[PDB]
């Protein structure tokens, strides 16, 4: 996928280039994961993909307790050396969520990378999106509310362009994949995901 | 105008019925104030109307310093006895704005009334709206973040219904009214304000 980046409190000069590269390379070669709602962004598939890539690179992971069993895996955290990676795709309250995480951060870790998906992707209801997270952080930054270094990453794709897509069907009850296919497609014109 | 109300921390049992009545009666007989952007919600006209009604009823007022001269008057505060009324129509960061106001509130006032306008009204860019403020407060309430009693009020109008409208044109430079008319209209189908 493609990515848009917003750095706060000079996360760019603080971040270990190699640690950032591991995250960046993983995201760039990663296809768009989608599932039925028709086709919507699949955060669990996405986090599973990220996890399988970073675990072998020695990133320690932790999966936050979901407000709903079938939501488990919608958000995931990774840590390595002094870097914290927080994938936030759920509808958990953004500012409150991070204010709470910020507290622990200040009580070691020196920079945090937050991964979100662009608004262009149709998704679960009220689920966080990049532009919204950026707006909120731009606002706090404006009044010097926080000093923690943050690299905010937005997962996006260009419109009307052939891309690799992974379509999955889950039997959410224990979660199971009953069907999956790796096809080609693109996003039309929020956007609409089209498969070939 | 019509109003929708959401109470937090039992603002409803704490609020002086007469103090609430002064606020409620003012809002109910108040027409929809609009101006050119075509026609959009006019917060200054609205606050001027509210101010002219409450000052004679002994509500002390205070107008917050705007982040922009021509924005001055977009938000206004009123106090009387133990009640705080905060009209919030601007794009100032909601949670941060109120967290800061909350701090002073806890350092007397016993309940706060926050007035916003519904999402149905086309308005200034990124300006706060009722449904958004409610979502954010519902979220903080969910995790017992604040205990301050709040009555959140949303200014709305029914669709396809004849209503009184005040259309104004300002020479924003010192603010001046160069043109104004009191007509009839309605909101079609965000919504679109139509005048007759």
From Swiss-Prot, chains A, B:
One of its GO terms (biological process) is DNA restriction-modification system. Homodimer. Binds 1 Mg(2+) ion per subunit. Its EC number is 3.1.21.4. Its cofactor is Mg(2+). It comes from Bacillus subtilis. Disulfide bonds: none annotated. It catalyses: Endonucleolytic cleavage of DNA to give specific double-stranded fragments with terminal 5'-phosphates. The keyword Hydrolase applies. This is Type II restriction enzyme BglII. One of its GO terms (molecular function) is magnesium ion binding. It is an enzyme of class 3 (hydrolase). Mg(2+) binds at residues 77, 87. It comes from the Bacteria. CDD domains: BglII-like. Keywords: Endonuclease, Hydrolase, Magnesium, Metal-binding, Nuclease, Restriction system. Gene3D superfamilies: 3.40.91.20. The lineage of its organism: Bacteria, Bacillati, Bacillota, Bacilli, Bacillales.
């Amino acid at each position: 996928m493609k990515i848009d980046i917003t750095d706060y409190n000079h996360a760019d000069e603080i971040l270990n280039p190699q640690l950032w590269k591991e995250i960046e390379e993983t995201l760039l070669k990663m296809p768009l994961h989608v599932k039925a709602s028709s086709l919507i962004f699949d955060p669990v598939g996405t986090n599973q993909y990220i996890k399988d890539e970073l675990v072998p690179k020695h990133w320690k992971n932790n999966i936050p307790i979901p407000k709903r069993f079938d939501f488990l895996g919608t958000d995931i955290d990774f840590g390595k050396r002094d870097t914290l990676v927080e994938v936030q795709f759920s509808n958990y309250p953004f500012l409150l969520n991070n204010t709470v995480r910020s507290e622990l951060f200040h009580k070691g870790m020196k920079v945090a990378i937050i991964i979100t998906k662009g608004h262009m992707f149709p998704a679960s209801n009220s689920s966080l999106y990049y532009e919204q997270a950026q707006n909120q952080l731009n606002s706090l930054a404006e009044y010097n509310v926080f000093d923690v270094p943050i690299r905010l990453v937005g997962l996006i794709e260009d419109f009307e362009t052939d891309i690799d897509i992974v379509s999955t069907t889950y039997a959410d009850k224990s979660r199971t994949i009953t069907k999956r296919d790796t096809v080609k497609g693109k996003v039309i014109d929020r956007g609409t995901i089209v498969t070939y």
